[PDB]
Design a protein around this ligand. Structure first.
Ligand SMILES: O=C(O)c1cc(-c2ccncc2)cc(-c2ccncc2)c1
Ligand SMILES: O=C(O)c1cc(-c2ccncc2)cc(-c2ccncc2)c1
Ligand SMILES: [Cl-]
Lengths: 243, 243
């Protein structure tokens, strides 16, 4: 009743000779759907999907004042051109600007970071590793279904940070909007520790329902990153959630 | 020069056998642009663009608890099908649901509505007429440049309501988002007093600037309503604000 497996969605992965999981949660009906119940519960490094809780914590502690505060480029040229510039919270989430969030994490510090992930009930709650890289190559692990549980709390302003912090992070998560739906989401790409995977987690707002989603997929090269959104959207289309 | 007139935009109205004004404001440069300085400063009924201030006031007074509160359809069949359903603040804005906002206005009441529009410096601040219809056929008037002035305060959380109220209304204004821009805006259609006009007011968020806009145009029939957005976007494209 609560979770239903739809193996027909595997066709959207084998289409591209790829492997992964899409997890959906119908908020109105309190019912979940996935192509792979086991992998839906397999826990991986969050990689840049960790920017959602990191943002919440940085805002609630005042490390980030608001979504307009500028974090200046430190002058080090990195391999991702969009990182080599000034950012605010909105553009730092849009371009997954790791070095900006590493500064947040150092200012938050290990103790507060650990306590807040416990308060959030986030994944395995384990920040072992460098305080500014554990979500990329440390001990923290989270599954797609755990991502959904966390996102539902955020959607409902039920996380143990201020309402304001939650509203700002949901603004920064804005990814796509049109007359048919709004998507608030965050991508991730885990490359430092095997298995290399891509993530996309968030939700689709409709007029009268919300569909939460979390997907990950094997990602041996960066060439396939667009499949994170494309496969998710094929599932959403199949299930008549978006046109 | 603070204000510049660009009459070449008139071609975008003439193309459609129309007349109107677009007003743009470059926030970084503090410079404004319009095709018609006179009409930019002529005042019209706000019609449904009034849902921006009405939302703010309803939220700040607690008439509306939050963006999820459901305003049940009163069961009176109206001729706009999307009005014959339950709404929250988000969908009421999206579908310009007049009867929901009329009830907001009744609960706000004349005295508080008047005081708040003065605090907002909103248009001619005149609510003469019926409290449940003055933005459709009463004495209130606002120009395109006055819409920009009000919207800039909202963007900066500088209106005399809480930050929370302003964030909620800006969420409810969300109209379009993609990798290139975000538009937050509200349409309007004034038919009860001549000249009948259409409005579109809001702003375009870019990575490193905001462009505020306010347009109105003659609208003898509802068949032309899509020109509000189409003409605005042609101006935005011409000025290399959006691709
Ligand atoms: O989520 C992404 O879309 C993405 C994330 C990263 C990244 C995130 C965190 N630590 C390192 C890299 C890198 C890239 C990328 C794009 C093109 N060519 C190479 C890499 C894309
Ligand atoms: O875009 C508009 O400005 C507009 C759109 C609708 C509408 C929304 C959804 N489905 C159909 C029409 C209704 C109205 C309206 C405003 C005031 N008095 C009556 C009608 C105006
Ligand atoms: Cl938003």
């Amino acid at each position: 009743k609560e979770w239903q497996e739809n193996k027909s969605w595997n066709a959207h992965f084998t289409e591209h000779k790829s492997q992964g999981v899409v997890v959906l949660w119908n908020e109105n009906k309190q019912q979940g759907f996935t192509n792979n119940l086991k992998r839906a519960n397999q826990a991986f490094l969050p990689a840049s999907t960790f920017k959602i809780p990191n943002s919440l914590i940085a805002l609630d502690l005042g490390v980030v004042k608001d979504e307009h505060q500028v974090f200046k480029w430190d002058g080090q040229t990195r391999d991702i051109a969009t990182w080599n510039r000034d950012h605010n919270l909105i553009t730092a989430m849009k371009y997954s600007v790791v070095p900006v969030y590493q500064e947040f994490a150092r200012q938050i510090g290990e103790a507060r970071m650990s306590k807040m992930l416990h308060a959030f009930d986030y994944g395995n709650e384990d920040i072992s590793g460098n305080v500014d890289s554990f979500w990329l190559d440390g001990g923290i692990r989270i599954s797609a279904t755990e991502q959904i549980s966390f996102l539902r709390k955020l959607y409902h302003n039920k996380l143990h940070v201020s309402e304001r912090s939650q509203r700002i992070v949901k603004q920064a998560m804005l990814t796509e909007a049109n007359g048919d739906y709004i998507i608030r989401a965050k991508t991730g790409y885990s490359t430092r520790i095997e298995p290399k995977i891509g993530w996309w987690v968030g939700w689709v707002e409709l007029d009268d329902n919300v569909w939460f989603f979390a997907m990950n997929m094997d990602m041996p090269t960066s060439d396939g990153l667009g499949l994170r959104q494309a496969i998710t959207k094929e599932v959403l289309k199949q299930e008549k959630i978006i046109p």
